[PDB]
Structure formats: C-alpha cells, structure tokens
Design an enzyme around this catalytic site. Structure first.
Site, short mmCIF file in Angstrom:
data_model
loop_
_atom_site.label_atom_id
_atom_site.label_comp_id
_atom_site.label_asym_id
_atom_site.label_seq_id
_atom_site.Cartn_x
_atom_site.Cartn_y
_atom_site.Cartn_z
N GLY A 99 24.38 186.55 59.96
CA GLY A 99 24.14 187.14 60.09
C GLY A 99 25.73 187.17 61.28
O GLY A 99 26.52 188.30 61.11
N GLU A 142 18.49 185.10 52.07
CA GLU A 142 17.01 184.76 52.05
C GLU A 142 15.83 185.12 51.40
O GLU A 142 15.83 186.77 52.38
CB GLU A 142 17.01 183.65 52.83
CG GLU A 142 14.71 183.31 52.50
CD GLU A 142 14.73 183.43 54.26
OE1 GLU A 142 15.69 183.43 55.19
OE2 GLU A 142 13.47 183.32 54.51
N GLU A 147 32.63 209.28 69.29
CA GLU A 147 32.36 209.99 70.66
C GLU A 147 31.87 208.94 71.95
O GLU A 147 32.25 208.62 72.71
CB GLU A 147 31.79 211.05 71.31
CG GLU A 147 31.03 211.62 72.53
CD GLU A 147 30.88 212.74 72.75
OE1 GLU A 147 30.18 213.44 71.48
OE2 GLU A 147 30.63 213.81 73.79
N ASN A 169 11.47 192.61 69.07
CA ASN A 169 12.25 193.27 68.96
C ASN A 169 11.94 194.89 69.16
O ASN A 169 12.40 195.89 69.58
CB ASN A 169 12.18 192.97 67.52
CG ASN A 169 12.87 191.76 66.73
OD1 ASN A 169 13.48 191.48 67.06
ND2 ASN A 169 12.14 191.44 65.84
N1 LIG Z 1 15.80 189.38 68.45
C1 LIG Z 1 15.80 188.55 67.81
N2 LIG Z 1 16.63 187.61 67.76
C2 LIG Z 1 16.60 187.10 66.42
C3 LIG Z 1 15.11 187.61 65.60
N3 LIG Z 1 15.28 186.26 64.21
C4 LIG Z 1 16.48 185.98 64.81
N4 LIG Z 1 16.86 185.70 66.31
C5 LIG Z 1 17.33 185.59 66.46
O1 LIG Z 1 18.64 184.73 65.98
C6 LIG Z 1 19.55 183.21 66.11
C7 LIG Z 1 19.81 183.07 64.29
O2 LIG Z 1 20.09 183.61 63.87
P1 LIG Z 1 19.68 184.92 62.49
O3 LIG Z 1 19.83 185.93 62.40
O4 LIG Z 1 17.50 184.07 62.33
O5 LIG Z 1 19.62 183.69 60.75
P2 LIG Z 1 20.28 184.63 59.79
O6 LIG Z 1 21.00 185.82 60.02
O7 LIG Z 1 19.16 184.72 58.48
O8 LIG Z 1 21.15 183.51 58.91
P3 LIG Z 1 20.87 182.31 58.07
O9 LIG Z 1 21.49 181.38 58.56
O10 LIG Z 1 21.24 182.83 56.83
O11 LIG Z 1 19.23 181.74 58.39
C8 LIG Z 1 18.85 182.89 66.71
O12 LIG Z 1 20.12 182.61 67.98
C9 LIG Z 1 18.25 183.28 66.78
O13 LIG Z 1 17.57 184.19 68.32
C10 LIG Z 1 15.11 189.18 66.41
O14 LIG Z 1 14.06 189.45 65.03
N5 LIG Z 1 15.06 189.08 67.28
MG LIG Z 2 17.98 183.71 57.36
#
Ligand SMILES: Nc1nc2c(ncn2[C@@H]2O[C@H](COP(=O)(O)OP(=O)(O)OP(=O)(O)O)[C@@H](O)[C@H]2O)c(=O)[nH]1
Ligand SMILES: [Mg+2]
Ligand SMILES: Nc1ncnc2c1ncn2[C@@H]1O[C@H](COP(=O)(O)OP(=O)(O)CP(=O)(O)O)[C@@H](O)[C@H]1O
Ligand SMILES: Nc1nc2c(ncn2[C@@H]2O[C@H](COP(=O)(O)OP(=O)(O)O)[C@@H](O)[C@H]2O)c(=O)[nH]1
Ligand SMILES: [Ca+2]
Ligand SMILES: [Ca+2]
Ligand SMILES: [Ca+2]
Ligand SMILES: [Mg+2]
Ligand SMILES: [Mg+2]
Lengths: 437, 54, 423, 341
Positions: free
Chosen positions: A146, A71, A254, A228
């Site tokens: 992710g 996205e 390493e 972050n």
């Molecule tokens: N530390 C940290 N965690 C994040 C951040 N953004 C999202 N998260 C965590 O990531 C998880 C959700 O996954 P996302 O990375 O937001 O979703 P995605 O990877 O974009 O995958 P989609 O489902 O397609 O949106 C949740 O547990 C959030 O708390 C961030 O900027 N910093």
């Molecule tokens: Mg997303």
C-alpha cells in the site's frame, strides 16, 4: 460524461474497494451478476453511473476498477466472493510474495517487476474511456505494498496520464489494528514521494473508525469488516457526486477546486453523521440541525483532531436523504453562533452544500442502521496536521537509533531517502502552521 | 447569509452559502532510480557471495 | 502457498524436531500415516506451509533429518510418527561427531553436507514460493552445532534471499554431556549472528529449572525438557500455520522483531505450566506469559529492556479482554520497553488451542537481557581457553587457536552490542 | 497504579503536586518522554496537545487548557473583551484598554485621550505587555507611544483603595481551578500583594508605590515587610479591616464582583477550549489579579496561566488540585467555592 478508474493497492485497498463496490451496486440497483434492471440503454450509455461502470452487450455493468496486491490471498477472496461475476480476470493482479511491511520492498524490489503489468491492465480500462477524468487510489499507509508500490504507481500515472487527476483514499496507521512496528516509516516514505502526484487525498485514521465502531455501533472488538463497511459509507458519500445527477463536485477537477486552494495542503478532513447501531429497533431520527452540528464534533471525524485550534480553507457539506436547503441554512446559522469556526483571511467563510434525496444505502445485515438523512462534511482544516505531528514524532524516535533501517537499505533504498522524506514532512508541518496560526 | 448558485434536479440540489467575504520526474528518471536500487542490491549480494566464498 | 523447509540435525535436533512434528501434526489433524482426520477447515487452510500433499491425499512433512550417527534417526523412524517422514529425507552418516564442532563443521560434516543440500534443493524445487528454512539443533554437540551451522552457511549461499530461522538449544553445565559444550556453543553463536534472521534461544538450564521448580519433576529427563520445547515451538509457529494478520510469515516476523540485524536472538515463553483441570483466566495467562519463570532462556527480563515483543493467545477467549490485559502489562511496566520503538508489542489470537488446554499464551521477546546467556557461555569458554584445556580435540581436526580467539571476540562484541541499547 | 510525567521543572505548584501524588503510593512517575502516562504536567510553551489522547487503554489528562492563552495574554485579553459580545466593548469591570503595535489602535487610543484632555478629566495611562520583568506610567500620550518604539495601553486607575495605616496600594490575587467538566472552583484563600510605600499620585516615576509586584517591593521598597510579612495580607486580616474601617465585609464589597468576573471570562471561552467530547481531558489553574478603587469597585488587571501560590497556601491548594482535578478522573483507594453556571 467522463469515466473514473478506481485502483485498489494492497490488502487495505482491496478489502476497502470490495466494500465500496458492494455498496455502489446496492445504491445503483446493480445485482451481483452485473445486471441492472433500471438501465434501459442496454450495452452502453453516458449516464452518471457510467463514470464508474462500463457495460457489455449482455447488459453486465463492470466496475472501472483494478485490484493489485503482491500476495494472492486477499484478491482471491474477490475472485470467489459475492460479486465475483462483476469483475473479469484482467482486473485482478496478484503476486507470489508480498512486501513484508517494507516500503522499499514494495517500491523498488517487487514494484520494479510488476509495475509494467499493472499499467498495462490500467491501459486496457483507459482504452474503454471516451473521456477519462482520472483515478481514485485506495491503499494503506503502513503496508509495504500500500505504501511502497502505490508511490511508484502514482509516479508512473503522472507520466502516462499527465493531464488526469488523481485522488487518494489513504488509511492512517493505528496501533490498535496495526500489524507492523515500521508503519510510521512507510507512512512518511510514501507521503514524501506521493505528495506531488496526488491532487486530493482523504486520510482515514483506523483509530477514529475503530472508536466510532466501538462507541456508536457497540462493537466490542471491531474487525476489518466492521471498519470497511463504515469506510465505504464515507467513500460513497464522497464519490456520490460523480455517480449521480447533480451540480457539485461533478468531476475530479472540482474536488481540488473546492477543497484544495494550496496544492501541498490537499488532505481534507472528513466528518460523518449519523452512525446508528442496527441492533436497536427504534432510534429517534436526527434532524438536519443535529446531524449538521455533529459534523463539528471530533468524535465523528475520520481523524481525531481539534478544528477549533486551526483554520478552515474550504468546507463542503454532502447530504443524503430528506434534506432541503432551508433547513441547512437554519442549521448553519445556529452552529456559527455556538461553534468556533475560523477561516483563513484570504478565504471566504462559507459552505458548499450538496444534497442527494436518496438516503444512505446500508448493506443488508450490516451494523449500520438505515437513517432518514445523513451528511458527510469535507473540510480542509489545518488541524489535520496533528496527524502528521504524531506520525513524524514516532518516525523520529526510531530513526534516531536507525532501528529497522537495515531492512530498507537491504532492498536497494539509500538511507538518505529517510531524512529526505522526513525533511519534506517537516516542511509540510511548517506549511500547516503558517496557514493556521 | 447569502445563498448563491442554487441548482435543482430530480435527484437533489446544490448551492453555496457565504457567511462572510474574505479579508514531475520523467519516465527515464524513474527508470534510473529503480535500476540504481537494483544495482545496490546486486552489489550487496555479490559481497555476501564473496564473503561466503572466503 | 508460502512453504517452509524444515531441517533437524543431530541428536538434540532430531529428538526435538520429531516431537515438534508429532505435536503440530495433531493440531492439524494429521495421523502417523499422513491421513487427515480433523473437524475444522482451519487445520488445512495453511497446512501447505509445513506439509507436502502427496498422492492419495497424504500430507508429508517438508522436513529433512540429518545426523552423522544413525542411532537417533533410527529411533525417529521407529517412533510414534516415524512413518510420516519422507524416507528419502533421512540423510545420515556412520562416523558421528564426538561432540566436536570441528568434526561437524570441517571434517565429518563436510563429507555429508552435499547430500543434505541435494535433498534441500529437491524440496525447494517443488515449492510454489519458498519462504525460508527453520533448523532445530543444539549448540553444545558436534553435528547439530558444527554441521548445522555449516548447512546454514551453504543454504544461505544457494538461497541468499530467503529467511533462515533456527531453534537453538544452548548448553548448561546443569544439563551437560561433555565439558567442551562452551567451545561448541561459542563457535556456533558467531555463525548464527551472521547467517540467521531469527533464532529462538532455548536454554537447557531454564528447561531444567522449569521442570524441577515449577512442574515438580524431581528427576527431569531429556524427554521432560523436550515437552516444554514442543509446546513452545508449536506456540511460536502458530502465526505461520493458521490464518492471521500478525507475523503471518517469516519475513514479516523478522521485520517486526529485529531492529538491528545481529540482535535477532529471542527469548521464548509459554503459559500455562501446570504441575491441571483448573480454568485459566486471561489476566493469568498474561501475567504468567510475562513472568521470567515462564521464560526458556534463563535470563531475567528485568535486567534488560524489551526491543520488541510478539504475543500469541490460543483458544476461545475474550479478544477485548486480551487487548486490555496486554495494554495493562505495557502500561504498568513501561520502563522495561524501550521508548524509541513505539508500540513494539504485537498481539495475535488463534482460536485453536493446543492439545490438552482450553487456552494458552506464547511469548516471543527480543530483550537485551539475552546478553546474560551469551555472557554465561563466554565465561565458561574463557575458563578453559585461558589454559587451552581440551583444545587438542579441535586442533586434531585442523583448527587453529586463532579461530577460537576470534570466536571469543565475536561473542564479546555481541554482548557489547546488547549493552549499548540497554542504556 | 496511575502514571504521570513532569515536563515543567520550574513549576513550584506542580512540583508540590508531583510530590503529593507520589506520597499516595498509587501514582508512579515515568520519564518525561514516556507516552504511556495517565497525567501530563505539561511544559509552559508548545505543549504537544496533538499527541494526547492517542494511547489505547489510557485515560489521559493534561494540566493545561489548549487555547486558554487568549485569556492569559495582555493583548489577547484586550482583543477578547472588545470583540466578544458576551463581554462587549461596554464591559464595566475591565479598564479601558487599547492594543498598540510598535490590527492597531493608535488612532482610536488618541481619540479617547483627547476627549479626556479637553474634559479636564484625569488622563493617566499605563503601557505594559507580556515581556515585562518594564512598565511606563505617564500622563502625556506622546511619551507612551515613544516608549513602546506588542503592547497594551489601558487607563491607569488614579483612585485606588488605600490601606491604612500606610496610605498604600495593593492588588488581589485569586486562584481558580477549572476541572475536566469545566467546573469553576475559586480557592477560598486569596492574597493581597500590597505596596509598603505610601501612594504618591504626584510623580509616577517612583514605581515603588504604584507597582504592587512582590519582586519590586522586595528590592526597590524601603518598607518591605513592615506592615505584613512579605507585603502579603490574607483575607482574614483584610476582611477584618473592611469591617473595622469601611463597615462592610470582603464578601459583599469585593468578592461578589470577583466571582462575577471569573465566571464571565471563563464562560466566554468555554466553547473554544472545552474538552467535554475530546479524546483527552484538561484542567488548569489560573491566577486572576484584581484592582479595587476607592468606590469599592473591582477591576480586572490580567489572568495568569501558570501562576505561583503563596508560601503559606501551597499545601492546601496543591492538595485541593489533587482532590478536585486529578482524583476526580483517577480515584484513589471543601477549600473551593464552586462558581455555578
Ligand atoms: N481500515 C482497514 N485497514 C486495513 C485493512 N487491512 C489492512 N489495514 C491496515 O493496513 C496496514 C497494513 O497494510 P496492508 O494493506 O495490510 O499491507 P499491504 O498493503 O498488503 O502490503 P504488504 O506489506 O505487502 O502486505 C495496517 O495498519 C492495517 O491496520 C482493512 O481491511 N481495513
Ligand atoms: Mg499484504
Ligand atoms: N490599569 C492599571 N491601573 C492601576 N494599576 C495598575 C494597572 N495596571 C497595572 N497596575 C499595577 O501594576 C502591577 C503590575 O501589573 P501587571 O499584572 O500587568 O504586571 P505583571 O503581569 O508582570 C505581574 P502578575 O503576572 O503577578 O500579574 C499591578 O499589580 C498593579 O498594581
Ligand atoms: N533439550 C534437549 N537437549 C538435548 C537433547 N539431547 C542433547 N541435548 C543437549 O545438546 C547438547 C549435546 O548435543 P547433541 O545434540 O547430543 O550433539 P550432536 O548429536 O552431535 O548434535 C548438550 O548440551 C545436551 O544438553 C534433548 O533431547 N533435549
Ligand atoms: Ca446503459
Ligand atoms: Ca501531476
Ligand atoms: Ca571419512
Ligand atoms: Mg549426544
Ligand atoms: Mg503576568
């Protein structure tokens, strides 16, 4: 010199990567337009900072990084952010619709359609490398992209780059900021298919970062920006050895050699100190002994757990600032007499120490106060399996009723992959218990 | 407490302290699994259209 | 650019749909002529989810108005925001449906459904990435109920990978127009069980009791009932219309709220409900938001268990205090939340409050107690069907008694499915 | 209102604690598998400490110290005392013990045995483990090792203090409560679990007079309940006896050593089990068992991690657990001796 390519997948990976590269530039003296005054070799070179930055004839230092998200709203912020000039369009890859917090949707449905494009954009960066070491992959556990797309990417990277190392920076799900009920599903699904393709993975639990922000920075309701900036400090301390002159953890290989004697047990625990609020004029500077002792407080770990009730397989100490070996050894000696530090019998009881004289760099206007000296401990302790136990328990609660399973089967994933992934985690918890009890 | 392999440079130094001595799937196989998942989606969609056709 | 296509069908659907567009148009700073006059960029950051941008910087709702009678839609075109809708998106017949599901679904409705789909296709074609559809309708009439569920079935056939969301008004003998409403509602609920991903169950009985008991309205009108629906629809769609992390689109909402495909019928709630200048504290919003007297489905939450819950707080308030109060609710009444779905309560906060309120809270619950609604409809259905009363209205349109028996069984199965997860 | 869960149904102590918490009108019991609890009365085995302290907005407290098993196991206790410098091999209040497997200490145990044999000193040893109801008391080393084929062999105290009338043996049970701040509270009320049979130092095969277990005395002893109800003498009677007979007090002759021993054991493991800076908190009730010889010297026998109380004392102690360990963390709307350290 050998190059390293950073890959940022999903919202968490992209926003964390954006924070890290902002910090990298501040540390190396790189300005938002990519210019580096201290770099006297214009348009090339094999310095230590070149492992993360390439150079154009015009003197621009371009991160060796790729951003991938299904996205565009998050990656579009990188296209127009403070460091927009660092990256060129070929580095930013976005889709039309995301994985809806569905591992199967990111892995199979949408992943199959965009995997070849991502590899192509990665192949371009690799073609610039004279001796590519491997990849650092940033992503969350709970998101659909992710978790789902990352596992597909990791599988293909093992195919296209069989000899390259791959390290992860993974965000463990925390309900206080989580955005989906099925994140335990996605976490266990992505860990199952990624386990054999990752050489070393640094898990960060949003719960830990969240409370460190509330307790040590006085943030009442921390945001992703707060989280972050702190995470990028940890990541920076871990990658500093790849970007600066030194002799410890100088290449990706390493990391595995020093922290991962058992391949499946490749999740080192990270502990960072000190975290001081910038909203106070003066704070008593902590000594080497005090910050080193803080590396054994659970309240400072990237994952809340008790190393006392586990066993160590390796332990590195990464110092930044005014630190000399004499003070480190004196601090360690005192800590051994007071702390419960048990190693496995087949491992030596010791600490690999790295010191960089340049103290930590803090984002101007951020929440973290400048300190004279800081340390990040990378310890491979079986105690981190407590995070697997918590995750597997929640998995068992929902999957017993097959709750939300239809969302994954509807994307072409077979229900058997659930139990197959859960059985792998069961063997993982069993490995940790055998090694540490 | 033994200190070994001390390396010093302008930007820092590193060493080791010993307190005590000791006591993949092919590109073809991945494509098949991705296509198998897509086929199950097509099958489920065809069943839906069949159901809607009735 | 995750566009939603809105459809309103029938008298109830168009009257509530019109109020919905009046409300959210005000929240986004859009005037009756489609001109923007707001003082915040948040109003426009996600305006494209519900609005098309036409020439001259006009914003045209992505809405389609459907009815088998011209009456109600004429009132809309002559209403306060009647001019904001795209004229080509008015699709209507002249015969009407006579509160008859068969007429809306099989005879009168079938004759008009193709022209509606042509307009839907025109809207979808100009969508960068269509999320899905949201339908407003009642289940007790003929057009919204019979033809509405016909449209849903054909929309799914043409867009099988898109989300279908409906606001469905359930009939109640206390706010009833005809005795056949249980027939029409029972036939429609099975269509919804199969062909929607999310359905907000708006019970006219609940809307009436709230207007009478709480709001102190002695003689509630349909307009009074539609005031509650407008406020609830604006609340449950806040996460779709403004920037945010939780339930930001229809598919992610479904993933968070629907653990089993057929159990996608939600109980909406709203707070405050004042019979009015007094300030409301965060603890008060949370307790009222969870109070059954603020529920729109006329079901007692304490008679079942929450599978999942979505909460949305609007206005400038203490986000720390929100988390505290939300955790307080779950920790004090944990028995009402199923233990096999960890952390099934998700909370979102939006800075922009609704019109006329400093802060508010919207409740979206997937509770097994919703079976009380389907049991109520099921009982009224059987009371008549056991004597085949009023069936001739339907057999005259080609339907057979077997289709009623099957609709009856499907309803009882849905009730049994809710009962198995309540134990 | 506070919430708690019960995961050990066989605990008579915490069954009463649960009954007390409910009667306060301010505590509510949830299902055993409900994670949204303030307090967990955990199970004896495999208590999931790793899942505690991860519930936002809930201060979580558990009634067991993770890692306290080192002190509450036959073999673990011996290893802890020998290897810990705070206690040291020169420890004077713990009987000479050795860990014997059926690492191992077979050769070191026999080395000290032979030394006693040649020195004409008493050479009576006792073999036991954590898998008892079964014990063996023998004066020949060969008999001890054959019986085992994890166990511990420690010196049997051949000269115990004998209560008169009866010429009988006994052991002292002390209940100790350690709260989340690691305050060590010693219950002012103990119990002497006495043997109703006269101590016969000739034949150790008749265990009715050598083993002071309440169960053994109630089934194998002919004089059960003869001198005291249930072979249980409390401190008031025992103190008066020491005054009338030995011209001393319970506090001076015995209680000082007991308090000293409790401090040493608990302070030794504090760094390993303390929950001071942990995401969850712990407290635990311990059962220390002591032996007293004819010289009025106190010896530690073992430590129980899940002890039961005496019938007459359940009310007072259990109420004390609520005040000191639970209400201190969750206040509502002294019977202990605080061992300072
Ligand atoms: N530390 C940290 N965690 C994040 C951040 N953004 C999202 N998260 C965590 O990531 C998880 C959700 O996954 P996302 O990375 O937001 O979703 P995605 O990877 O974009 O995958 P989609 O489902 O397609 O949106 C949740 O547990 C959030 O708390 C961030 O900027 N910093
Ligand atoms: Mg997303
Ligand atoms: N070294 C020793 N010298 C003298 N007597 C001993 C002894 N070890 C044990 N005893 C006697 O044997 C009895 C049982 O010992 P032990 O405490 O090891 O068994 P146990 O754990 O099954 C009972 P509890 O759990 O209540 O302590 C003691 O009460 C004591 O009277
Ligand atoms: N809340 C509300 N309910 C309505 C309204 N108009 C009709 N209804 C309900 O809808 C049912 C009648 O359906 P209706 O929409 O008039 O039939 P249709 O035009 O053929 O779809 C009855 O249960 C009414 O109580 C309205 O404006 N508001
Ligand atoms: Ca250069
Ligand atoms: Ca590999
Ligand atoms: Ca006609
Ligand atoms: Mg009508
Ligand atoms: Mg015992």
């Amino acid at each position: 010199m050998r190059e390293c390519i950073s890959i940022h997948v999903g919202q968490a990976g992209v926003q964390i990567g954006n924070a890290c590269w902002e910090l990298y530039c501040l540390e190396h003296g790189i300005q938002p337009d990519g210019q580096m005054p201290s770099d006297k070799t214009i348009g090339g070179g094999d310095d230590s900072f070149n492992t993360f930055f390439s150079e154009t004839g015009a003197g621009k230092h371009v991160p060796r990084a790729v951003f991938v998200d299904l996205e565009p709203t998050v990656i579009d912020e990188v296209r127009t952010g403070t460091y927009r000039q660092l990256f060129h369009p070929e580095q930013l890859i976005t889709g039309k619709e995301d994985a809806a917090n569905n591992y199967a949707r990111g892995h199979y449905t949408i992943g199959k359609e965009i995997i070849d494009l991502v590899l192509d954009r990665i192949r371009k960066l690799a073609d610039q490398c004279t001796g590519l070491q491997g990849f650092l992959v940033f992503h969350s556990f709970g998101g659909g992209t992710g978790s789902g797309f990352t596992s597909l990417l990791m599988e293909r990277l093992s195919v296209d780059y069989g000899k390259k190392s791959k390290l992860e920076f993974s965000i463990y799900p925390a309900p206080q900021v989580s955005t989906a009920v099925v994140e335990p599903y996605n976490s266990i699904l992505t860990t199952h298919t990624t386990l054999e393709h990752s050489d070393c993975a640094f898990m960060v639990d949003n719960e830990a970062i969240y409370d460190i922000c509330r307790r040590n920075l006085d943030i009442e309701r921390p945001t992703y920006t707060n989280l972050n900036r702190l995470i990028s400090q940890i990541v920076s301390s871990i990658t500093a050895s790849l970007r600066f002159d030194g002799a410890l953890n100088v290449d990706l290989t390493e990391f595995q050699t020093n922290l991962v004697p058992y391949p499946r047990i490749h999740f080192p625990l990270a502990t960072y100190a000190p975290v001081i609020s910038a909203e106070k004029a003066y704070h008593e500077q902590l000594s080497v002994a005090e910050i080193t002792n803080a590396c054994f407080e659970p309240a400072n770990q990237m994952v809340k757990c008790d190393p006392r009730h586990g066993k160590y397989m390796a332990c590195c100490l990464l110092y930044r600032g005014d630190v000399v070996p004499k003070d480190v050894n004196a601090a360690i000696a005192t800590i051994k007499t007071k702390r419960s530090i048990q190693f496995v019998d087949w491992c030596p009881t010791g600490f690999k120490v790295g010191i960089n004289y340049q103290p930590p760099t803090v984002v101007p206007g951020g929440d973290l106060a400048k300190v004279q000296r800081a340390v990040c401990m990378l310890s491979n302790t079986t105690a981190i399996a407590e995070a697997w136990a918590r995750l597997d328990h929640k998995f068992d609660l929902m999957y017993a009723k097959r709750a939300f399973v239809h969302w994954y089967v509807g994307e072409g994933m077979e229900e058997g992959e659930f139990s197959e992934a859960r059985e792998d985690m069961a063997a993982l918890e069993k490995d940790y218990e055998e090694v540490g009890v | 407490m033994e200190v070994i392999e001390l390396n010093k440079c302008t930007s820092g130094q590193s060493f080791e302290v010993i307190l005590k001595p000791p006591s993949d799937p092919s590109l073809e196989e991945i494509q098949k699994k991705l296509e198998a998942a897509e086929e199950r989606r097509k099958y489920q969609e065809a069943e839906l259209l069949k159901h809607l056709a009735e | 650019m995750r566009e939603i296509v809105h459809i309103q069908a029938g008298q109830c659907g168009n009257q509530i749909g019109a109020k919905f567009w009046e409300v959210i148009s005000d929240e986004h700073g859009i005037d009756p002529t489609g001109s923007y006059h707001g003082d915040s960029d948040l109003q426009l950051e996600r305006i494209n989810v519900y609005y098309n941008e036409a020439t001259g910087n006009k914003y045209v709702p992505r809405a389609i108005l459907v009815d088998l009678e011209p009456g109600t839609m004429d009132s809309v075109r002559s209403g306060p925001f009647g001019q904001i809708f795209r004229p080509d998106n008015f699709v209507f017949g002249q015969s009407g449906a006579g509160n008859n599901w068969a007429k809306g679904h099989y005879t009168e409705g079938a004759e008009l459904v193709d022209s509606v789909l042509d307009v839907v296709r025109k809207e979808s074609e100009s969508c960068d990435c269509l999320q899905g559809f949201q339908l407003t309708h009642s289940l007790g009439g003929g057009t919204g109920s019979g033809m509405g569920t016909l449209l849903i079935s054909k929309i799914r056939e043409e867009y099988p990978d898109r989300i279908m969301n409906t606001f469905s008004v359930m009939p109640s003998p206390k706010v009833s127009d005809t005795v056949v409403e249980p027939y029409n509602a029972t036939l429609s609920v099975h269509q919804l069980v199969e062909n929607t991903d999310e359905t907000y169950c708006i019970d006219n009985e609940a809307l009436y009791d709230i207007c009478f008991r709480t709001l102190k309205l002695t003689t509630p009108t349909y307009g009074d009932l539609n005031h509650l629906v407008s406020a609830t629809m604006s609340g449950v769609t806040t996460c779709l219309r403004f920037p945010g992390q939780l339930n930001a689109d229809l598919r992610k909402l479904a993933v968070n709220m629907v653990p089993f495909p057929r159990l996608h019928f939600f109980m909406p709630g709203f707070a405050p409900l004042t019979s009015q200048y007094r300030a409301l504290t965060v603890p008060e919003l949370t307790q009222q938001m969870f109070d059954s007297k603020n529920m729109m489905a006329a079901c007692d939450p304490r008679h079942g268990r929450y599978l999942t819950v979505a909460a949305i707080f609007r206005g400038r308030m203490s986000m720390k205090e929100v988390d505290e109060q939300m955790l307080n609710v779950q920790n004090k009444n944990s028995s009402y939340f199923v233990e096999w779905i960890p952390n099934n309560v998700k909370t979102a906060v939006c800075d922009i409050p609704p019109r006329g309120l400093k802060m508010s809270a919207t409740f979206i619950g997937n509770s097994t107690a919703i079976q009380e609604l389907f049991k109520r409809i099921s009982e009224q259905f059987t009371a008549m069907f056991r004597r085949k009363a009023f069936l001739h209205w339907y057999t005259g349109e080609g339907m057979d008694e077997m289709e009623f028996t099957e609709a009856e069984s499907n309803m009882n199965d849905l009730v049994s499915e809710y009962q198995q997860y309540q134990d | 209102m506070y919430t708690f869960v019960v995961r050990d149904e066989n605990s008579s102590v915490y069954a009463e604690v649960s009954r007390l918490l409910l009667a306060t009108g301010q505590w509510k019991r949830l299902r055993k598998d409900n994670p949204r609890f303030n307090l967990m009365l955990g199970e004896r085995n495999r208590l999931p400490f790793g899942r505690l302290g991860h519930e936002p907005g809930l201060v979580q407290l558990v009634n067991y110290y993770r890692g306290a098993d080192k002190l509450c196991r036959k073999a673990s206790l011996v290893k802890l005392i020998k290897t810990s410098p705070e206690l040291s091999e020169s420890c004077t209040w713990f009987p000479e013990s050795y860990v014997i497997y059926p690492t191992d200490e077979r050769e070191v145990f026999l080395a000290a045995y032979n030394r006693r044999r040649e020195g004409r000193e008493g050479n009576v040893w006792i073999a036991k483990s954590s898998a008892g109801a079964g014990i063996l008391i023998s004066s020949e080393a060969s008999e001890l090792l054959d019986f085992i084929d994890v166990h511990v062999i420690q010196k049997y105290l051949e000269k115990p203090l004998l209560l008169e009338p009866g010429h009988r043996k006994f052991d002292i049970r002390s209940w100790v409560l350690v709260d989340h701040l690691y305050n060590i509270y010693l219950y002012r009320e103990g119990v002497l679990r006495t043997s109703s049979e006269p101590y016969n130092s000739a034949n150790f095969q008749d265990k009715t007079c050598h083993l002071t277990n309440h169960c053994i005395q109630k089934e194998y002893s002919k004089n059960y309940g003869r001198y005291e109800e249930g072979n249980e003498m409390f401190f008031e009677e025992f103190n008066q006896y020491l005054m009338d007979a030995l011209n001393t007090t319970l506090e001076n002759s015995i209680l000082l050593q007991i308090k000293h021993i409790i401090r040493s054991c608990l302070m030794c493991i504090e760094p390993a089990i303390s929950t001071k800076h942990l995401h969850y908190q712990s407290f635990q009730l311990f059962g220390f068992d002591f032996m007293v010889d004819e010289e009025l010297k106190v010896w530690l026998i073992e430590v129980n991690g899940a002890p039961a109380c005496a019938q007459k004392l359940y009310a007072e102690l259990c109420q004390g657990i609520v005040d000191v360990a639970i209400s201190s963390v969750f206040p509502l709307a002294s019977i202990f001796i605080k061992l300072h350290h």
